[PDB]
Amino acid sequence: DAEFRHDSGYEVHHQKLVFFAQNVGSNKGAIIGLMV
Amino acid sequence: DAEFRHDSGYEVHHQKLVFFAQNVGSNKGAIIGLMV
Amino acid sequence: DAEFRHDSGYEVHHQKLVFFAQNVGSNKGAIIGLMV
Amino acid sequence: DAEFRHDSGYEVHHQKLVFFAQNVGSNKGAIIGLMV
Amino acid sequence: DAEFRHDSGYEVHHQKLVFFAQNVGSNKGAIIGLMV
Amino acid sequence: DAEFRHDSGYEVHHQKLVFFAQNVGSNKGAIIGLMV
Amino acid sequence: DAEFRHDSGYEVHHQKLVFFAQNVGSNKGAIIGLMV
Amino acid sequence: DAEFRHDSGYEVHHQKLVFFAQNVGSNKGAIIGLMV
Amino acid sequence: DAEFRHDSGYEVHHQKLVFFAQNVGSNKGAIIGLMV
Amino acid sequence: DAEFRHDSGYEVHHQKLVFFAQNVGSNKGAIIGLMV
């Protein structure tokens, strides 16, 4: 048998100025800020 | 048997100016800031 | 048997100016700042 | 049997100016700042 | 049996000017600053 | 994130003679061969 | 992140004569052959 | 990050005569052959 | 990061005569052959 | 980083006569042959 526990702490604060903001806790796909 | 525990601390703050911001806790795919 | 524990501290702050910011706690895929 | 614990301290601060910033705690894939 | 503990201190600060910055705590793959 | 896979192979054969046989793949409770 | 895999091989054969047989792959509770 | 794999080989054979047999691959609780 | 692998070979055979047999691959609890 | 591998060979055979047999590959708890 097997017991599994997991804690993932994700935090972010005080983004005064930003033109493209992308805060993702976990990704398994495609993340694009800008594409043509 | 096997017992597994994991702690992943992710934090970020005070981003005064940035044109492309991408904060990802964990990635298993594709991350692109800009593509054509 | 086997007991496993892991602590991964990821932090970053005070990014005054940056054109491409990519903060990733852990990566197992592709990370590209810019591609054509 | 075997007991495993691991502490990985990752920190970075005060990046006043940078055109391409890529802060990765751990990598097992491809990291590219710019490709054509 | 065997008990294992590990501490890896990674830190970096005050990067006033840099065109390509890549701060990686640990790498087991490919890291490229620029490729064609 | 975390991906977990586990393989537990349990097999037993050729028990010619036995008065009390108790073959359990995994136990988290009480197992008693005989009680009064 | 963390990837975990585990293989536990449990096998037993040719128990010609035994009055109390208790074959358990993994135990996290109480196992008693005989109690009063 | 951390990748963990574990192989635990448990085998036993040819127990011709035994009054109390208790074959346990892994134990985290109480095992008693006989109690009053 | 850290990669961990472990091989634990446990085997036992040819126990012709024994009144109390307790074969445990790994123990983290209490093992008692006889108690009152 | 750190890579860890471990091989623990445990074997025992030909126990013709024994009143209390306790074969444990690894112990981190209490092992008692007889208690009152």
Numbering used by the authors:
A (entry chain I), B (entry chain G), C (entry chain E), D (entry chain C), E (entry chain A), F (entry chain J), ...: 1 to 36
Which sentences from the paper describe this structure?
For tg-SwDI mice, which harbor the Dutch (E22Q) and Iowa (D23N) mutations within the Aβ sequence, we observed three different polymorphs. The most dominant polymorph, which we call DI1, accounts for 52% of all reconstructed fibrils and reveals a symmetric dimer. The 3.3 Å map of DI1 was used to build an atomic model of the ordered core between D1 and V36. The two S-shaped protofilaments of DI1 are connected through the extended N-terminus. A hydrogen bond between D1 and S26 and a salt bridge between E3 and K28 of the opposing protofilament stabilize the interface between the two subunits. A hydrogen bond between Q15 and N23 stabilizes the first half of the S-turn. This turn is further stabilized by a hydrogen bond between Y10 and a backbone oxygen at N23i−1 in the adjacent layer within the same protofilament (denoted by the index i−1). Although DI1 fibrils also differ from Aβ40 fibrils extracted from the meninges of patients with Alzheimer’s disease, they share a similar N-terminal fold. The extended N-terminal arm of DI1 overlays with the N-terminus of the human Aβ40 fibril between residues D1 and Y10 and with the murine Arctic Aβ filament between E3 and S8. Finally, in contrast to wild-type Aβ42 fibrils, in which negatively charged and solvent-exposed residues E22 and D23 induce a kink in the main chain, in DI1 and DI2 fibrils, mutant residues Q22 and N23 are interior, in extended conformation.
